[PDB]
Amino acid sequence: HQPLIARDGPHPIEQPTHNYMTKIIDRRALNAAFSLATEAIALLTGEAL
Amino acid sequence: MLADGFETDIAIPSGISRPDAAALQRCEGRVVFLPTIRRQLTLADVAHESFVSGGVSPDTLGLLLAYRRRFPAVITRVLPTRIVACPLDVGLTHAGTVNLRNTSPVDLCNGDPISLVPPVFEGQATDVRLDSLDLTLRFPVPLPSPLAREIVARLVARGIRDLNDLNVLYYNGSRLSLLADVQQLGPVNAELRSLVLNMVYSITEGTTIILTLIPRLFALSAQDGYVNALLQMQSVTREAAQLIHPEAPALMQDGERRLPLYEALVAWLTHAGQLGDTLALAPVVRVCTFDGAAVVRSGDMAPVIRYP
Amino acid sequence: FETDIAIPSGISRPDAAALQRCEGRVVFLPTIRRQLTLADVAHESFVSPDTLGLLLAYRRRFPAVITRVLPTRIVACPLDVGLTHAGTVNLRNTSPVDLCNGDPISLVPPVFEDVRLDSLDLTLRFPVPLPSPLAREIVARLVARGIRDLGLPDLNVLYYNGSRLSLLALGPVNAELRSLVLNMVYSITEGTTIILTLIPRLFALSAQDGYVNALLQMQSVTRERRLPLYEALVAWLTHAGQLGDTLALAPVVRVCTFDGAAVVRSGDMAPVIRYP
Amino acid sequence: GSPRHHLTRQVILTDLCQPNADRAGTLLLALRHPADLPHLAHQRAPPGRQTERLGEAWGQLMEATALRAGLVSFNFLVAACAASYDARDAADAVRAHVTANYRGTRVGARLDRFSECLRAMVHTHVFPHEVMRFFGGLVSWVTQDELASVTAVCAGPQEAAHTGHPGRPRSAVILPACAFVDLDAELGLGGPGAAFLYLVFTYRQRRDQELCCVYVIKSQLPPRGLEPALERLFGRLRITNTIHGTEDMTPPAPNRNPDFPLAGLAANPQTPRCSAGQVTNPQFADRLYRWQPDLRGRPTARTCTYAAFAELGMMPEDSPRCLHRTERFGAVSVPVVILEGVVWRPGEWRACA
């Protein structure tokens, strides 16, 4: 809203107003790599063949 | 209410895009030419589409002559379904105060009568075009009256040239120029007739006495700094005094009972003093700022109460 | 709506009596405002201007008629925004002219004949509410006098409402009205030569024979070194278009009498409306 | 909601207007005080017309009503100018109840006299659009011997003012069908819109063959743009005034003025000139060019007027409604145009020179 101060005498200017503001989302992304060698996956999995 | 105000309803159609719908809401205090005093009209009537003559879209001088055949109205609130205006010839509002908006590059002051002028200036030809409806809205420019008598004089005197520069104005030391374009021969001849009629009708038998004062003005211009600042550097009566020595006829027919100068001045006021209303339209409107500021800047609103 | 013109303190005994007499009289304010000092009203605010300077100033300013006068403030209502709301505001003659019913009344600067407050150090000039068909006469007679100084005894005789006016009654008003005379003559002598350069034949034609047949062509619709002529057109249309406003004397006031006499004499009050 | 209007009262002699015969809802036109008439004729007349005619024509009217800024009702004014309208079948019907309903002896001797006054007005050149002033339309009256108390609306809507009789309190604007000239039908404007009402006089300036017509014109045009519409109707009167309105003014025979030589004098540098101090000295002003313009007997603008209009009011409807009925004024049936809902606004006159 646009705020109001009242004035005396004859009424020169206003009718009460609104403002509809719209703003555009800017999208981004974040990356983080992570590696595991085959020497460790055989420990995380379980039994062998 | 019926007497004090008169609200028209310029209807807005169904199919309007929002790039077009958000342009009308910036057109809050404008000047709109209704052809009638109907209470329900459409945008195809207001716009420049209805302004065209038979096939010929007229230039800035013929744009004058179809203003004064119409009714100036001021937008008071833009609703989504309609535009509400108030024609100035009927009445303003109950309170009698309608806010306008400067489109001029020129400030306003208190008590200046407003006449409206076409978008004549350069950097000023701003036509709100609605693409979904193919509508342009050529909004006129509210100017002070001593500008509006210059510009009409600059446009009418320019067409008298081309029947056989000028376009540079100055107001309060700010340079501004108006656009130059070839003029349609039709409306120019409608302006020349309104000159010469109101010009020849201001000539009376008593004016041959006033013409004998031309050597009195010129001999006075060497003493008074008011008359030297009056005549002009490029006037005619300065060159009429250096070459022609006029003198009056001695007697008048029935010269006892009639007043020769009194009939000459009244005929001058009703025909040549009236001339500024016969070329342009009437200054209905003047500015009465109440408490804000005595000078209204460009792009700002200004309260308005009617003038005779 | 009513404005308040507050009197500054320091009022002597005759000075409160002089402001008590101006009950129904016209006052020019600069801008419509509730708080307003008396010094913006008075003749000090106009600087001394001549008759042309008053005619310019009486169009930029906004007229107001005084209501009841309080001992502390002057309560006045303006003729533009405050009179369409209320019904009828009384107005007093300062004129020698009797007002009739139904006249449109403009205002004239005080040419004919000054309430001065001595303690406050200011004067007060008040306009003359005479009807508009006389306003285009009384100005036009006096401008026609000043041209003769660069007369005729009927020029000073005005009959309105069966009453004789004498404009003569001469010295200082001649020097007071000088800038009108220098602008009225010039705008005609420039006017009747530019016509006479564009169409140079207009005096050489025979009066009732050739000039009429050349006049009927001007009236009909169906017929369609260098002199600085076309720069003098613009020079004349802005000056003659300026004197068209100032010497219009467009009417503010229309008198509609109700339960009273049809003729309002000098010194009496007249009821006033400006709206249907 | 009740609209706002303004009443006037005035004690009026009933010589020229009759609020009893003319019922509630007719126009009223006020005059100047007639002591001003024989002097304005002495001053504003063109050279060579009888200034001693207006003072005699009005003197024959006051000596005809005995067998003071008064009032002339519209129905009295139409029947006085009744010998100049097109619809003469109805113009002799308006006169038919003027002589038969108005209180007095030989009312038919006033109409032939008051029209002789109006012919003396055009001839002695005090035009009655400078004399006839608008006064409001009738709402009620109070009768008395030789005078009446007239109540009227100087400004406002006609249908708001209360009449006084609670049987029929309202009043519509009543006009005879001889003066009411449309410009919607005759031009082809059939579209809706608010319409303006105008009072229009017309003259015709000849030697002892002069006329008068009073019209009430309803139009959708502004007062700034009426002059092209009055010219189209009354252009016949415009032509007859420019050639016959200038008579007994003595012309210069033959011409004495040569052509105006400033375009030829200023081009040649050999032409003798003068300085600012050299002019207005006879030794140096006789060396210049002598130029004696003769404006005598020219058809000036005020001697070429054919009409004069003014604002009168409006109808703020979308489609303004007129009627054409034949009301009975006593025993005479008269074609009457009835206007519905007129909002009064006076205005200043404007000559069509």
Q: Would you mind telling me the total number of residues written for chain A in this entry?
A: 49
Phi, psi of B296 (to 5 degrees): -100, 120
Q: Is B129 exposed, middle or buried (0-12, 13-18, 19+ CB in 10 A)?
A: middle
Angstrom distance (rounded) from CA C92 to CA C95: 9
Query: Is D222 near chain B, with CB under 8 Å?
Result: yes
Angstrom distance (rounded) from CA B191 to CA B152: 10
| CA dihedral of B198, B201, B207, B211, whole degrees rounded to 10 | 40
Contact D224 B277 (CB under 8 A): yes
**For an interface test with C, which of B262, B263, B285, B288 has the most C Cβ atoms less than 10 Å from its Cβ?**
B262
- Check: CB of residue C232 under 8 Å from CB of residue C194: yes
Dihedral sign of CA atoms B171, B173, B174, B177 in order? positive
Angstrom distance (rounded) from CA D155 to CA C274: 9
Contact B37 D343 (CB under 8 A): no
Closest Cα in chain B, distance from residue D274 (Å) = 5
Angstrom distance (rounded) from CA D143 to CA D11: 10
Measure Cα distances from D100 to C80, C180, C221, D93 in Å. 48, 56, 46, 11
Looking only at the bridges linking them, the beta strands covering D147-157 and D6-13 are: antiparallel
- Check: CB of residue B304 under 8 Å from CB of residue B31: no
Residue C150: how many CB atoms within 10 A of its CB? 14
Rounded-to-5 percentages of helix, strand, coil across chain A:
15, 0, 85
Q: Which residues of C121-130 are buried (b: 16+ CB within 10 A; e: fewer)?
A: ebebbbbbbb
Q: Which residues of B70-87 are buried (b: 16+ CB within 10 A; e: fewer)?
A: bbbbbbbebeeebbebbb
Query: Is D146 near chain B, with CB under 8 Å?
Result: no
- Check: CB of residue D146 under 8 Å from CB of residue D13: yes
- Check: CB of residue D288 under 8 Å from CB of residue B245: yes
Angstrom distance (rounded) from CA D312 to CA D175: 14
CA A37 to chain centre: 37
Closest Cα in chain B, distance from residue C64 (Å) = 14
Angstrom distance (rounded) from CA D283 to CA D294: 25
Of residues B77, B95, B301, nearest to A13 (C-beta):
B301
Element (H, E) at D8: strand D6-13
- Check: CB of residue B257 under 8 Å from CB of residue D51: yes
- Check: CB of residue B270 under 8 Å from CB of residue B63: no
Find residues 18-47 of chain A whose CB sits inside 8 Å of chain C: none
Dihedral sign of CA atoms D293, B201, C237, C145 in order? positive
Question: DSSP states of chain B as a string?
Answer: -TTT---EEEE--S---HHHHHHHTT--S--EEESS--SEEEHHHHSTTTT--SS----TTHHHHTTTTSEEEEEEEE-SSEEEEEETTT---SS----EE--SSS-EETTPEEEEE-S-BTT---EEEETTTTEEEE--EEEEHHHHHHHHHHHHHHHHHTT---SEEEETTEEEEB------HHHHHHHHHHHHHHHHTT--TTHHHHGGGHHHHHHHTTT-HHHHTTS-TT-SHHHHHTTEEE---S--TTTTTS-HHHHHHHHHHHHTTTHHHHHS----EEE---SS-SEEPTT-EE-EEE--
Rounded-to-5 percentages of helix, strand, coil across chain D:
25, 25, 50
Ramachandran assignment for D241, one of left (phi > 0), alpha (psi -120 to 50 degrees), beta (any other): alpha
Contact B95 A15 (CB under 8 A): no
Q: Is B28 exposed, middle or buried (0-12, 13-18, 19+ CB in 10 A)?
A: middle
- Check: CB of residue B72 under 8 Å from CB of residue B6: no
Angstrom distance (rounded) from CA D116 to CA D80: 9
Dihedral sign of CA atoms B176, B180, B184, B186 in order? positive
Contacts with D261 (C-beta within 8 Å, 6 or more apart), sequence order: B244, D289, D291
Q: Which residues in chain B have their CB less than 8 angstroms from residue A15's CB?
A: 77
The three-point CA angle D24-D27-D31 to 5° equals 125
Dihedral sign of CA atoms C127, C182, C139, C249 in order? negative
Angstrom distance (rounded) from CA B20 to CA B43: 13
Angstrom distance (rounded) from CA B306 to CA B285: 5
